[PDB]
Amino acid sequence: STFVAYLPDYRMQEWARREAERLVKYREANGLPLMESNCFDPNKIQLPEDED
Amino acid sequence: NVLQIVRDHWVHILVPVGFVFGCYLDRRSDEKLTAFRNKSLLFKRELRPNEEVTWK
Amino acid sequence: SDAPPLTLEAIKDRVLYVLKLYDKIDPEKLSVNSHFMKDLGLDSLDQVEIIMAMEDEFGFEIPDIDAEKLMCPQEIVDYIADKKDVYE
Amino acid sequence: KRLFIIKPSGFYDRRFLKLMRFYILLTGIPVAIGITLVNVFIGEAELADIPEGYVPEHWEYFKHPISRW
Amino acid sequence: PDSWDKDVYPEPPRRTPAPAPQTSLPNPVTYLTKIFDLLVDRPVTLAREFIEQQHAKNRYYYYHREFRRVPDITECEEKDILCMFEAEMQWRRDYKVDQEIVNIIQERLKACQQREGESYRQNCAKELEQFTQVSKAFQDRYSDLGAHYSARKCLAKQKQRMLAERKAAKEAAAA
Amino acid sequence: AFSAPAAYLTHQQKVLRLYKRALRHLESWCVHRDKYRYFACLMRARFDEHKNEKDMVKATQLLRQAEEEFWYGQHPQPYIFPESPGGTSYERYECYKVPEWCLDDWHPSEKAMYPDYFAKREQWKRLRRESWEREVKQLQEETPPGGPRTEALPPARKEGDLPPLWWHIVTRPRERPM
Amino acid sequence: MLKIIIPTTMLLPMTWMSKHNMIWINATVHSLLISLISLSLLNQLGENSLNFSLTFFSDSLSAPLLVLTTWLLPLMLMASQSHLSKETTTRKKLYITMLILLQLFLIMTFTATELILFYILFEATLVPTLIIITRWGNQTERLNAGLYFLFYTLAGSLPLLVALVYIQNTTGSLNFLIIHYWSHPLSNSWSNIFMWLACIMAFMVKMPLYGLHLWLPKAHVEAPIAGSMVLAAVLLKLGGYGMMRITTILNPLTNYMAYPFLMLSMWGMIMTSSICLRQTDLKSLIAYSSVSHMALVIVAIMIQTPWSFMGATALMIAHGLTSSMLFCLANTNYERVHSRTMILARGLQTLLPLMATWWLVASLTNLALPPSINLIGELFIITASFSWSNITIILMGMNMMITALYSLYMLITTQRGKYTHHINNIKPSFTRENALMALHILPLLLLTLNPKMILGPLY
């Protein structure tokens, strides 16, 4: 139980928290939206030519 | 006098020996999957002045 | 503490007290071995009333099969003592 | 008066309980003392930026001494 | 304290009124507070001072781990297993980071609701607006992927949404 | 609870039981003592009015009518003695009752306390072990060939006999065990 | 992960070379050490799995299952040595050999990287279980129980073999990582429908799904105590593990092929809970309890959400511990009075107070008292089902009420009332039985203290 209690953070919970803090700080100051609906840049996506 | 003690309790080394042998075999198995050591786009790194491999 | 350790003498005293508060039984002619039907000349209904009077006095009911059998104050006292684990 | 009270044997349950307590405490009092000593005399690491040209060890990415060990 | 950045977790300037006694009677709360201070807060402070003195004699640092940016799932060939693996790992890390961003926003909202008291419906409009925006963005990105989610399914969802938006825009243009 | 039952009840037994039930329920209705005495005397007069009926058919018809009237007019919440089968303390102390055979499994350290009690217990056990066969044989003799017909047991008759099947009646736990 | 496999293979000759009077001691000590070693597998990552080699890998779903298996072995050893005292030395060693082989097959099953190897091990687990049941059971029904256990399983598992070899001929691989990365949707055709059924029915019969569960009461009642422990705690979870693995390639067909199994799971959950209310055998009640809990697990796996997967993992672990504890509790009374009828021995709290406390804690965890991991899993599954459809709460709600009813019915019938007068051979609880109950129950609350270790990879 002691060993399990003191297992190192390989799930990266604290790393993710610190990364999110950095991102929120940067985006809040610049006036940028906190989050983006698209997680992939549309410039690297090529939609089909014709929809008709 | 340790003859009888050993012949009565020598079965107590089989499991620890199996554990250390399994550790050794796991290291040997890891030794055969180094085709991408220090080659991933995320962890590619310049070597230190002294070290030879990034992991074993 | 709780109620005292009920004894056979107290049980007999209370039984005789209740029986001597009965109007159909003469006090002096009543004895601890007096029979209800033979000696005292009571019918079954009087015996039922006496059993109910005993129940009221001791605070506990007596089953009808057991109640029918008792005929003298000795039987009543013995039944009460056996019920309440009275040995002294 | 004082009467005898009939009960089932309470010896074996009490013996098991005290054996379990003894062994659990036997191994868990040293662990608690060691944890307290480590926390008092070897605190947690302080977050700092990676200096230029330094490549930290993999265990150097955690803050608690026991987790790092 | 300086443990956290006060820009990520902001608070109002904390205006508190000065005490204005209007009775000749003593205030039992002040007497009890003085007793609690002298009897609890000082020994605890001394113990903390001793512990920090011991800590200062053994100082070591741990570093936040940095990750480079690798090609995304869009720049990967159909059956290229290694590039797909790296892209999937990066996407999973970004998913965790987005969850933590939503967590920070929700913490802000809860703190505002508790802090503002009886005026929370009016005094917490900005935090509610921020949570609505972040929730909408997060929902678009990850909702309905389901168990066994991956970067490919997220990309398919985004492509479908872009196709629908393009068709809607072109039909509205013809109006 | 102590007497062996009979194959059936008699007419007078049924009348007495109905009389007791009616008196108890009337007392439940008549809370106060003087009112209860008044109506109990009225009930007794009503009961002994038809005491001298030599036609058993009409006697049973009257008993049937009286039982129907009692069921219509009974108290829905009659008084029950606290330790009676419907009372508030009926089986309250049953969880404190421990059978005597449990003492055979006490650890010798537990039996080190109370030496005289366990000496008396050993005497009682020896008595039972000596009397068992005589009890069994007396039951064998006194039992009719076609098996027993009632649940009544014979007493001891010989020099130092004991009433057969006595161990679990004599060694009851208690009525207030703990 | 040979550092865990090899020590068990060494348990084998250690048992067969021990003195006639030290087999239990040696087996117990080294089993506990192997469990301690396996405890290291709980250090899992957040993105991918631990890929030890080309053959074995450890995920956040299989690590708690491996820990549960390795922890269950010593408990079975302690539970078995009482009723095997009159057995000869060779047969005792053979019993321990069966248990060790079962653990080895289970350990290899949960870490195989390929589906065919997983199939071979998950099917090899049959032989030791069947031998244990049919050789060391008590009554003559054990033979029929073994037949039911064998054929119900194989009739589901053989079409899975056909489907697996077909899939490998189609896509070129059965490796789970390749299968996950190169996943393609399933069209709506009769061939795909039957492929879905072939890939699903074996795991369904393992759970077992309501209507396909008749083998379970027979096998779990007729087995010896260690057989019942390992059948309820680990072997039922093979179906859930395999189903969560295989559902990766079944989308989007599951979206509608899950309806009959969902209806069966919910209604048969209600039915098995109701069956538990009128049961004269104490072990059959625990078996039907297992069926109800596994029906909940089936629902969670079928609706395919992160919350449902988390709840399924937590519920599987919690149920394993609770059901093993309940079986041991019933076996104690059976060893005392040599009967399984529930109303024979009553008022046992008067005679055995500490065992009554163990009964109370086991039946409290059975009804999912918060904040036990039983309730964590049940509540996660209920929330996921509510999101799936708001009307499931009614069926789920009925089940919660019924489970409490039959759990407390079992407790009150066995522990309260007045002790039967004629039974005078109820000896005090041994230290071994109390230690068995404590080793069952303490890990449950310890896991409650840190619930992310049993919440699966979707955490």
Ligand SMILES: CCCCCCCCCCCCCCCCCC(=O)OC[C@H](COP(=O)([O-])OCC(O)COP(=O)([O-])OC[C@@H](COC(=O)CCCCCCCCCCCCCCCCC)OC(=O)CCCCCCCCCCCCCCCCC)OC(=O)CCCCCCCCCCCCCCCCC
């Ligand atoms: C009996 C058995 C019977 C059967 C039962 C079943 C048993 C099963 C057991 C199975 C095994 C289980 C093992 C579990 C392993 C887990 C260990 C672990 O992870 O430790 C975690 C944790 C340690 O945290 P950490 O991450 O290691 O430390 C991080 C920091 O770096 C540290 O920060 P720091 O730098 O400030 O250092 C603090 C340091 C030093 O702190 C201080 O010194 C300051 C304290 C305040 C003092 C200030 C005033 C007093 C002095 C003033 C006067 C003197 C000075 C001036 C002199 C003049 C006087 C005027 O203290 C410590 O180091 C922590 C204590 C060590 C505990 C370790 C636990 C190990 C247990 C393993 C054994 C298991 C068996 C049990 C046996 C154990 C023995 C009984 O330990 C705790 O449990 C802390 C709890 C205390 C918090 C306060 C409670 C808050 C209450 C909130 C809830 C309110 C609701 C009401 C509910 C109340 C219920 C409590």
Ligand SMILES: CCCCCCCCCCCCCCCCC[C@@H](O)O[C@H](CO[C@H](O)CCCCCCCCCCCCCCC)COP(=O)(O)OCC[N+](C)(C)C
């Ligand atoms: C008989 C008498 C009983 C009553 C008397 C008892 C007296 C009091 C003792 C009871 C203790 C009260 C419990 C209160 C909780 C305090 C402990 C808690 O704080 O520790 C937790 C830690 O608990 C452990 O993590 C959980 C234990 C792990 C359980 C695994 C079981 C071991 C394996 C056994 C076999 C496995 C079978 C099941 C297979 C899956 C905190 O977790 P965490 O938030 O992180 O800690 C933050 C700081 N860290 C990370 C630096 C450490």
Ligand SMILES: CCCCCCCCCCCCCCCCC[C@@H](O)O[C@H](CO[C@H](O)CCCCCCCCCCCCCCC)COP(=O)(O)OCC[N+](C)(C)C
């Ligand atoms: C006792 C517990 C046992 C375990 C329970 C196992 C559950 C198995 C149930 C299988 C679930 C669904 C199977 C097939 C999917 C749809 C079923 C069908 O009825 O739906 C319609 C099918 O239409 C008609 O029903 C045709 C089927 C009629 C013949 C089937 C026989 C059913 C009779 C019941 C026998 C019991 C079966 C179980 C044996 C125990 C849909 O219309 P259609 O779009 O055209 O078909 C879709 C497939 N397409 C797209 C390729 C065309």
Ligand SMILES: CCCCCCCCCCCC(=O)SCCNC(=O)CCNC(=O)[C@H](O)C(C)(C)COP(=O)(O)O
């Ligand atoms: C609260 C509401 C409840 C009240 C409702 C109840 C109303 C019932 C009142 C009317 C019923 C009767 O009287 S019905 C009267 C029935 N008559 C007979 O049976 C005639 C033959 N007599 C005998 O059998 C015995 O002598 C015997 C009389 C039993 C005495 O026994 P002892 O002398 O050997 O003790």
